[PDB]
Amino acid sequence: PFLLDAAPCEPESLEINKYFVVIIYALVFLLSLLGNSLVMLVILYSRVGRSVTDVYLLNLALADLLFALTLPIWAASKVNGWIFGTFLCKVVSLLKEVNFYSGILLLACISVDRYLAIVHATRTLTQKRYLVKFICLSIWGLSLLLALPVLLFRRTVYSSNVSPACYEDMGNNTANWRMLLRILPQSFGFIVPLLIMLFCYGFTLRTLFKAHMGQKHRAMRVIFAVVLIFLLCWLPYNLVLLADTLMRTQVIQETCERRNHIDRALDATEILGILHSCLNPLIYAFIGQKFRHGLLKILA
Amino acid sequence: PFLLDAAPCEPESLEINKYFVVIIYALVFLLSLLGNSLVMLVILYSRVGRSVTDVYLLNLALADLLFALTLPIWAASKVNGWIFGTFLCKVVSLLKEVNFYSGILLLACISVDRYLAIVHATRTLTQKRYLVKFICLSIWGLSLLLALPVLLFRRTVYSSNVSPACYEDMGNNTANWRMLLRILPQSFGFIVPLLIMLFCYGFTLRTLFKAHMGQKHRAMRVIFAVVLIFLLCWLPYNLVLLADTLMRTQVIQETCERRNHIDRALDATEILGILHSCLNPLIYAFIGQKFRHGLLKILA
Amino acid sequence: ELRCVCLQTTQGVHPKMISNLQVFAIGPQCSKVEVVASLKNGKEICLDPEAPFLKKVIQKILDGG
Amino acid sequence: ELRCVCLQTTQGVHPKMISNLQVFAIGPQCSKVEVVASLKNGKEICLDPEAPFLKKVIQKILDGG
Amino acid sequence: IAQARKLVEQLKMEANIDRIKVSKAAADLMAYCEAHAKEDPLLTPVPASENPF
Amino acid sequence: IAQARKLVEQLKMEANIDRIKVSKAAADLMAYCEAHAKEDPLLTPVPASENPF
Amino acid sequence: TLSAEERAALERSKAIEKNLKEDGISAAKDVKLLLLGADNSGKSTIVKQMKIITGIVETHFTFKNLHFRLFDVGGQRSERKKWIHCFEDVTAIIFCVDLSDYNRMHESLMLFDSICNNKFFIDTSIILFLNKKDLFGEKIKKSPLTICFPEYTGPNTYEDAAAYIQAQFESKNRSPNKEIYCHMTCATDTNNAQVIFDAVTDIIIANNLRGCGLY
Amino acid sequence: TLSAEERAALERSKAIEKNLKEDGISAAKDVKLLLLGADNSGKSTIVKQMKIITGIVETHFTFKNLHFRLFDVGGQRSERKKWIHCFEDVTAIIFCVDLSDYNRMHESLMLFDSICNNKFFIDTSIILFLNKKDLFGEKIKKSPLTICFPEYTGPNTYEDAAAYIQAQFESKNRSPNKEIYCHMTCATDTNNAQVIFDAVTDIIIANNLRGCGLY
Amino acid sequence: DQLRQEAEQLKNQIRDARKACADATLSQITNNIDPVGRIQMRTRRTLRGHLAKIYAMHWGTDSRLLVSASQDGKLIIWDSYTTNKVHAIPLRSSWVMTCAYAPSGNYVACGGLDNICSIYNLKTREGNVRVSRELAGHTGYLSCCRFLDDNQIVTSSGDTTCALWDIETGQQTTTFTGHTGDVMSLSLAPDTRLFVSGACDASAKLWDVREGMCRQTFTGHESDINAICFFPNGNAFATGSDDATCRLFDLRADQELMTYSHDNIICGITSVSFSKSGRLLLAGYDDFNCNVWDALKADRAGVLAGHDNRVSCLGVTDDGMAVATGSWDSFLKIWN
Amino acid sequence: DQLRQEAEQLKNQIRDARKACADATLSQITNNIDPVGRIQMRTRRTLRGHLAKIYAMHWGTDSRLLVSASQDGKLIIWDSYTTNKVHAIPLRSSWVMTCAYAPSGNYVACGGLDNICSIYNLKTREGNVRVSRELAGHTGYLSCCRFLDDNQIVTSSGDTTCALWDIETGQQTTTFTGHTGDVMSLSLAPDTRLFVSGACDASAKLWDVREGMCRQTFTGHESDINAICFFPNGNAFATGSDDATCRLFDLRADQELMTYSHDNIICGITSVSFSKSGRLLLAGYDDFNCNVWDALKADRAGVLAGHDNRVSCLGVTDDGMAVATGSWDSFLKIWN
Numbered sequence A, B: 001p002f003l004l005d006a007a008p009c010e011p012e013s014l015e016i017n018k019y020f021v022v023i024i025y026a027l028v029f030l031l032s033l034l035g036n037s038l039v040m041l042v043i044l045y046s047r048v049g050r051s052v053t054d055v056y057l058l059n060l061a062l063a064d065l066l067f068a069l070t071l072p073i074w075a076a077s078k079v080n081g082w083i084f085g086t087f088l089c090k091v092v093s094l095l096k097e098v099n100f101y102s103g104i105l106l107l108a109c110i111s112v113d114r115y116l117a118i119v120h121a122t123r124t125l126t127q128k129r130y131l132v133k134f135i136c137l138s139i140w141g142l143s144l145l146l147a148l149p150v151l152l153f154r155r156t157v158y159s160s161n162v163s164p165a166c167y168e169d170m171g172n173n174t175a176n177w178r179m180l181l182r183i184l185p186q187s188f189g190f191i192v193p194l195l196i197m198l199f200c201y202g203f204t205l206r207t208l209f210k211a212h213m214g215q216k217h218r219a220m221r222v223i224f225a226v227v228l229i230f231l232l233c234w235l236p237y238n239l240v241l242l243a244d245t246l247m248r249t250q251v252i253q254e255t256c257e258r259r260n261h262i263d264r265a266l267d268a269t270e271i272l273g274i275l276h277s278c279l280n281p282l283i284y285a286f287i288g289q290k291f292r293h294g295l296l297k298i299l300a
Numbered sequence C, D: 001e002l003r004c005v006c007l008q009t010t011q012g013v014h015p016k017m018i019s020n021l022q023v024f025a026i027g028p029q030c031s032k033v034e035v036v037a038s039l040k041n042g043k044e045i046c047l048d049p050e051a052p053f054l055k056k057v058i059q060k061i062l063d064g065g
Numbered sequence E, F: 001i002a003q004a005r006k007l008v009e010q011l012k013m014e015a016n017i018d019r020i021k022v023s024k025a026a027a028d029l030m031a032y033c034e035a036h037a038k039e040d041p042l043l044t045p046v047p048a049s050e051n052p053f
Numbered sequence G, H: 001t002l003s004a005e006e007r008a009a010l011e012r013s014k015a016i017e018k019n020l021k022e023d024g025i026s027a028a029k030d031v032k033l034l035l036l037g038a039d040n041s042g043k044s045t046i047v048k049q050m051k052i053i054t055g056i057v058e059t060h061f062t063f064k065n066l067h068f069r070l071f072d073v074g075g076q077r078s079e080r081k082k083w084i085h086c087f088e089d090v091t092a093i094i095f096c097v098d099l100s101d102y103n104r105m106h107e108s109l110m111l112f113d114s115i116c117n118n119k120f121f122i123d124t125s126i127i128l129f130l131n132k133k134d135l136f137g138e139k140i141k142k143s144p145l146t147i148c149f150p151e152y153t154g155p156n157t158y159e160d161a162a163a164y165i166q167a168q169f170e171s172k173n174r175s176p177n178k179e180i181y182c183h184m185t186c187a188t189d190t191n192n193a194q195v196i197f198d199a200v201t202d203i204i205i206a207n208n209l210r211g212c213g214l215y
Numbered sequence I, J: 001d002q003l004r005q006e007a008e009q010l011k012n013q014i015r016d017a018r019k020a021c022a023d024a025t026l027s028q029i030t031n032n033i034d035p036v037g038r039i040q041m042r043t044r045r046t047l048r049g050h051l052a053k054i055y056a057m058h059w060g061t062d063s064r065l066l067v068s069a070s071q072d073g074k075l076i077i078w079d080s081y082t083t084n085k086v087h088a089i090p091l092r093s094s095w096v097m098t099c100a101y102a103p104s105g106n107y108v109a110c111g112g113l114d115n116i117c118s119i120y121n122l123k124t125r126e127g128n129v130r131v132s133r134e135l136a137g138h139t140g141y142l143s144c145c146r147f148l149d150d151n152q153i154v155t156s157s158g159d160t161t162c163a164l165w166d167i168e169t170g171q172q173t174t175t176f177t178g179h180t181g182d183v184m185s186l187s188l189a190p191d192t193r194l195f196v197s198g199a200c201d202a203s204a205k206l207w208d209v210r211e212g213m214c215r216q217t218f219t220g221h222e223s224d225i226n227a228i229c230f231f232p233n234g235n236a237f238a239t240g241s242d243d244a245t246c247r248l249f250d251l252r253a254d255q256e257l258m259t260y261s262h263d264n265i266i267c268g269i270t271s272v273s274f275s276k277s278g279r280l281l282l283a284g285y286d287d288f289n290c291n292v293w294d295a296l297k298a299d300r301a302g303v304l305a306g307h308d309n310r311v312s313c314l315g316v317t318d319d320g321m322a323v324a325t326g327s328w329d330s331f332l333k334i335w336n
Helices: A015-045 A052-080 A086-118 A125-129 A132-146 A148-152 A174-181 A183-209 A216-248 A256-273 A276-285 A289-298 B015-045 B052-080 B086-118 B125-129 B132-146 B148-152 B174-181 B183-209 B216-248 B256-273 B276-285 B289-298 C052-061 D052-061 E005-015 E022-035 F005-015 F022-035 G004-026 G105-116 G133-142 G158-170 G192-212 H004-026 H105-116 H133-142 H158-170 H192-212 I002-021 J002-021
Strands: A154-157 A165-168 B154-157 B165-168 C018-024 C034-039 C044-047 D018-024 D034-039 D044-047 G030-037 G057-059 G066-072 G092-098 G126-131 G180-184 H030-037 H057-059 H066-072 H092-098 H126-131 H180-184 I043-048 I054-059 I065-070 I074-079 I084-090 I096-099 I107-112 I117-121 I130-135 I142-149 I152-157 I161-165 I172-177 I183-188 I194-199 I203-208 I214-219 I225-230 I236-241 I246-250 I256-259 I269-274 I280-285 I290-294 I299-303 I311-316 I323-327 I331-335 J043-048 J054-059 J065-070 J074-079 J084-090 J096-099 J107-112 J117-121 J130-135 J142-149 J152-157 J161-165 J172-177 J183-188 J194-199 J203-208 J214-219 J225-230 J236-241 J246-250 J256-259 J269-274 J280-285 J290-294 J299-303 J311-316 J323-327 J331-335
Touching: A015 A052, A015 A256, A015 A276, A015 A289, A052 A086, A052 A132, A052 A276, A086 A125, A086 A132, A086 A148, A086 A154, A086 A165, A086 A183, A086 A276, A086 H192, A132 A148, A148 A154, A165 A174, A174 A183, A174 A216, A183 A216, A183 H192, A216 A256, A216 A276, B015 B052, B015 B256, B015 B276, B015 B289, B052 B086, B052 B132, B052 B276, B086 B125, B086 B132, B086 B148, B086 B154, B086 B165, B086 B183, B086 B276, B086 G192, B132 B148, B148 B154, B165 B174, B174 B183, B174 B216, B183 B216, B183 G192, B216 B256, B216 B276, C018 C052, C044 C052, D018 D052, D044 D052, E005 I002, E005 I214, E022 I246, E022 I256, F005 J002, F005 J214, F022 J246, F022 J256, G004 I074, G004 I084, G030 G105, G030 G192, G066 G192, G092 G105, G092 G192, G105 G126, G105 G158, G126 G158, G126 G192, G133 G158, G158 G180, G180 G192, H004 J074, H004 J084, H030 H105, H030 H192, H066 H192, H092 H105, H092 H192, H105 H126, H105 H158, H126 H158, H126 H192, H133 H158, H158 H180, H180 H192, I054 I323, I054 I331, I065 I096, I065 I107, I074 I107, I096 I142, I107 I142, I117 I152, I142 I183, I152 I183, I161 I183, I194 I225, I203 I225, I236 I269, I236 I280, I246 I280, I269 I311, I280 I311, J054 J323, J054 J331, J065 J096, J065 J107, J074 J107, J096 J142, J107 J142, J117 J152, J142 J183, J152 J183, J161 J183, J194 J225, J203 J225, J236 J269, J236 J280, J246 J280, J269 J311, J280 J311
Parallel strands: G030 G066, G030 G092, G092 G126, G126 G180, H030 H066, H030 H092, H092 H126, H126 H180, I054 I096, I054 I311, I183 I225, I225 I269, J054 J096, J054 J311, J183 J225, J225 J269
Antiparallel strands: A154 A165, B154 B165, C018 C034, C018 D018, C034 C044, D018 D034, D034 D044, G057 G066, H057 H066, I043 I331, I054 I065, I065 I074, I074 I084, I096 I107, I107 I117, I117 I130, I142 I152, I152 I161, I161 I172, I183 I194, I194 I203, I203 I214, I225 I236, I236 I246, I246 I256, I269 I280, I280 I290, I290 I299, I311 I323, I323 I331, J043 J331, J054 J065, J065 J074, J074 J084, J096 J107, J107 J117, J117 J130, J142 J152, J152 J161, J161 J172, J183 J194, J194 J203, J203 J214, J225 J236, J236 J246, J246 J256, J269 J280, J280 J290, J290 J299, J311 J323, J323 J331
16 A cells, blocks of 8 residues: 555665674774884884974874774674673773874874975974974864763663664754764864865975976875875765765655665775775885885894 | 563574474475375275275375475475465465374274274174275364364464464464364374274284284284374374463463473474374385285386 | 664554554654554554554553453 | 563563563464563563553653653 | 097097188188178277167 | 105104013003992992982 | 166165175175095084085084084085185185094195195185094004104104194195194094184184284 | 072073074074085185185075075195084085086096085085086187097087086986086176075975975 | 007097198288277276176176176176166075076076086066076086077086086986096087087087087197187187187187287186177186287287276177176176 | 115014013903993983084083083083083084083183184183183194193194194194194093094004103004093003094003904994093994993993984093983983
């Protein structure tokens, strides 16, 4: 009859995706741990040539290392749900979100440092890039401030259709509050850093195209690679999140097929974004001759 | 707290038992089909020596063959539940129950025939064993009569904890009506036939111990084997059924562990009883020289 | 992500066909109460929480005898 | 074999801890109505169908706003 | 001596028989089975309308 | 001709030196480092209560 | 059965069939036994309750609510192969042997060997009667049991000699599903009917056991 | 810092540190360049805006809000290996070559070869100045460019001869991360300061690129 | 001793003369006659009511009435069309081996191991069947009674002799001797003036009813002859023996014409009968099935089968419309 | 030409006489003295405030006040106990290569590539530090200024000569010649009557301050000598060269006693200093770390390390309580 129009939309999940997700998460854990540990070792073994970039890379590697350290519990939760308790849900979510925000903001600050060092090299503004310590401390504090909502408003949620989750419980109107809270990661995590990076790197490229240095081309390639990597890693997740927000807000018509598609896309894009902890050491640090030479020396 | 005393008893099932059950059911299907077809072929190929025992074995083999033919759908239902519809549930249950009752009653009638042929061999009562046709027809009619409740009061039942079933829907008080209906299989299916068989075979053995025939011992062994096979096949299922009835009637205290144990025992004893369609041709027919000689001749 | 279980709702169903009524209260999953009716046919429907029909249905089901 | 889902029953539970109420009506499964309450803790309880508590709980849950 | 006396007497009569070649006898038996062949309801099936059985 | 004249003169003075066997010189340097050995805060660590640094 | 006359003809046929079935019922309470043996061996004087009735001779004595019909085939003096198949359905074979006749003993053995291994009597049990114990007991003392059986080696006592004769007769069985019920009889024995009755009842059980499928 | 006198001593130290840091800030807006080259090669008359100030000679002309400090090391007449490491942190090296001197050309090449491949100056870019185009242009016609460079084979034109001299100087680079910015100058050239300014800005970008990790 | 030599030379003269008449075998002359194909015959009637083995059966002259004797001691007369029982005659002795039907339908002679040929009258004024005459004088079991007229019957016994009787007086008018074994069968010629008897000495010999003279003797079988029947023209006859072979002998040639042996046949023939045309030779065997032999080519033209036990008697109607078979399973079946 | 032969034979006489005095090496006589173990020295203070490479440093006579010159053009006087800056003297020329401290604490002479030895007065009545006298007369870069008194200073330059000055008048009282290369270092003997200067000709020669006479010359190094310092008793001295080797020469024996070369050392020595006892020979190297040598057994008795760039100056207090090191990373570190 016509009652088929009104029917529950059964949530769908598969075990093959579970197995694949576990494999990917474990591989990422191992790779990120290795890379971050190597970077920290190289930077800290010798105090000679401790420059601003070294400090920024140190903080970034620390953040990525903590993110990787938190990953495995997230993988187990994706496997069978949150059986580990409320306290661990709170702590792990706090640590993960803090490190994610810190990594993004440190990437933006690195872009700013490069802009100041190249475009304003001959000016007096480049003397303001010796404040790495205070800037990084402020970035960490701001990341901590922006992740309080996760610690305060998260707990274990037990449903019938689906396994338990480390979700948010803000009250009766939890859905809309969660939607609003989602604005912070998409503003202080995607848009602001992306705009800053684009501005700084574009002016940097404009200066570098006008110069006669032999090694300009490789710098251009590296900057383009960094921007493209950031986009590939983060843009899909935010686009899917925006689509979900619109679908909940009825701007886009809601249907079960769209729900399943968006859930799968969220999982895939979270997996894709998680790759930022493994590629940052290669893109930002290991592509420099100084780091490679230091590593080879340390292996002695 | 103390609320743990009041908690739902989660029904439990395992896929290993599913796989084992399917294998057993298929093997039994094949064996029963083969044996019954061979018996029917041997009996019907030659009309020479068409005796009473031949007629009884013919009807018995027909019943067992129909039971085996119905088995596979029952196995699939045990696998994933009744997805085949209400009509098939009704028809298959009717056929299965009819054939089960007919097999039991034919075993009892065979015992009666042997008692009449041996103990009352020299008397005038043995001339009443030439009524095989009417007796078998009455047995089939009675089996049909006793299985009407299954056809009338069965349908598909959809639950939440468990998959669909080909259960009974007699109304609001369905449980107690089902309990009462269970009396028929345990009275006209176990007790009455068992008592008749024991009486007849005991007096037969008493006569055979007093005689000087050389082949008395093998007859004693065959009779004991028949009785033991019947007991092993049917007694456990009825004992488990009686235990379930008592547990529902609160004579035995009810607990989740007992429920799970009884469900597993029901499954196992149904499997064990289903073996009567494969062993009857060996016990009753193939152990006779005449049948083996006829089979060897037919293979020509 | 947790989501509501009932996208569209129905107000008309014969009580005699109802076997289960599952009520989800307001919480993280959804912002509105939602009642799911599982019928003897094996299908599922989403009833209107605010309709008069639900209350009468529940009262009847709890007073079978 | 189908069996009842609630062997023993409880009459006292704080409404604020209740997340789901599943009502099984009289049928082949059981001869008595049975209401199962799933709490936020992740546990399950079997309430008394005939107690006054159930009706008030249901009315409250359907009138959250 | 008085038992086999009649035996040779019987053989004396059995030897004086006007015999006929089997070639002629075979043809004579063939002619009869061919002549009275249309009146055999067994060699050739009778029509169902003329079958008392 | 006027540059290396002073060179040989310097070598004349450098050759007339009352030299001493290295065996005696080695012992003399050994005695000094052993005599003034209790007053070396570097060879033997100074107590923490008498350490200005 | 359309015409009025043909309706009564069908009624006549059905009335005939009722008596045919009724006579068959009355013909199932009788036991058909076959009498065999050499001449002057007591084959006509087994049971003193004779109630007899050249060719075939019948005897229809009854015992324990059971009718025993004894058919004596002696006197035919023809080839047995042509009419012995008429008695293919007899319940048992009664064989009479005279122990005092040392010359007909070999003749009796030939009769037993032929009958026991006959194709029609391959499953009919044999009730063998050894007659005249007293005459044999007196005869052996005067003449030892060696002129008739040169292969005898055991003691010349009555127990071993009589058992030796019994062993020879059962050595000709050579078949399964057949049992030979022996018994030693004398002239002044009245319980010959009892011996036949228990053997016949024992034979019926064996045939019933095979039919029931127990064996 | 417990006693009253020691509290003021700590205040004196902190006041000294403020001026030390302040002077360092004012010492970051200046570019430190090194002047090298043979005698009479124009190494003292590159820019007509001199504003100078035996030993070390400084020149502190400014251009485009940037302070350029030129250090002339000529006149020391000592071993360069002992004091050339003081200028290890100079931004660039300014080398002056006189094209009209065919006898000091080989002497200039030895100076360029030693300075370019020095261990302290392995990464300092060199701004090479080729002076007196007009004098070289008139000199080549009178005497071809073969007495100084016997290996020359190309045309005796000014363009090929001047470029041939430039190739020899850059053939001594033999190192990466170092760029030689050449320019042809004459006596009546006023834009020498502009040429130095763009080269210094170009050198800073290369060092900044390496520091930022882009290259 | 001298007469023994005379006996031997007479046999040699017969054998040489018999062999000289043979020019071509029967199967060699009719090699151009087309085969009769497959004679598929279907059971039309099943006559039940006997409760013992059936040993004999004879057809009525009108091809509608049958008679059958059994070990149960009952003599039943069947209506072969509607399967009705016309008469049921209880015998004195249950051991009946042969049973005949009169050519006029008035009487029925039916006897056996009792050495007596009992003759029953059917058309009596009292409405019942009575024993008109009991013929005695045979010292052996009786077989193959055959009516000549209403007052003349030929019988065969195990005394190695056959007899010609007079029913009115009851005395043995003629006795035919010459066999050296039990005589198992006889058949009357269509011209009712000659008959042939098959005995256990593996020889069948032609006898004259008027003179009582053994006109000719026929040999060739390896075992005892069990059945015999004339060719429809009364110039040849076919025999069935325990040798599992059937043979066709010619009265004029005094020599067998052809044999009807098949390699798959083991058991001997019980009954022999001919069709109305003289082309299909039906024979009953001990392996529970009857075979139809093309009497001119010795080819098996179909098999009747159907019976559960040994087929003991065969019968073909006078008009040739049907074939009746009886067996030890107490059933008569009518084929067409 | 004749004098050249005279020069050669004089060298042969010196070499033969020098070799005849050698009976046993220093490392062969003190082979029974127990080793000093491991001298683990920990950084107690870190003096920061310089914004350029540190090229020189001198200890105050009271072992509490320091002085350090850098490329930034600043002259800082440190309180070595509380790490306070007592004075900050801005120099005229930023190219300073040496910098000395007066034995009385009243003056400070500190000069470099400007060919001028500038002397500053600390105890002035106006409260500031003024340039008391600027000594001129050297045509090469200046190195290793050393105060004799408050009115007498010895200086070394790249003119292959050293000079003795009078601060009051400002005239060069005595000039010491004889070197054939830039003179890189000098050290004053404890008895303030003799001094030794190490030059770039791989030779260090002992000079008399009163007579201006080269009393003796010492050879053996393969490269230029970079640093020099007396044994505490003023009877021996140790040199550091670019040859990555340190050597100990005896004034009385005129022959080197032992060498302080290690196979793992590649870069040359920058500074040389002795302990108060004359047992630990501290030397600064170009590979950013200082090594402590047991001056009697040539055994590495620990390594200071810690610095990030080349260690350019060493200093041991008069009481021997601490060791100060300066490097090109603009940091002074005090060890104990």
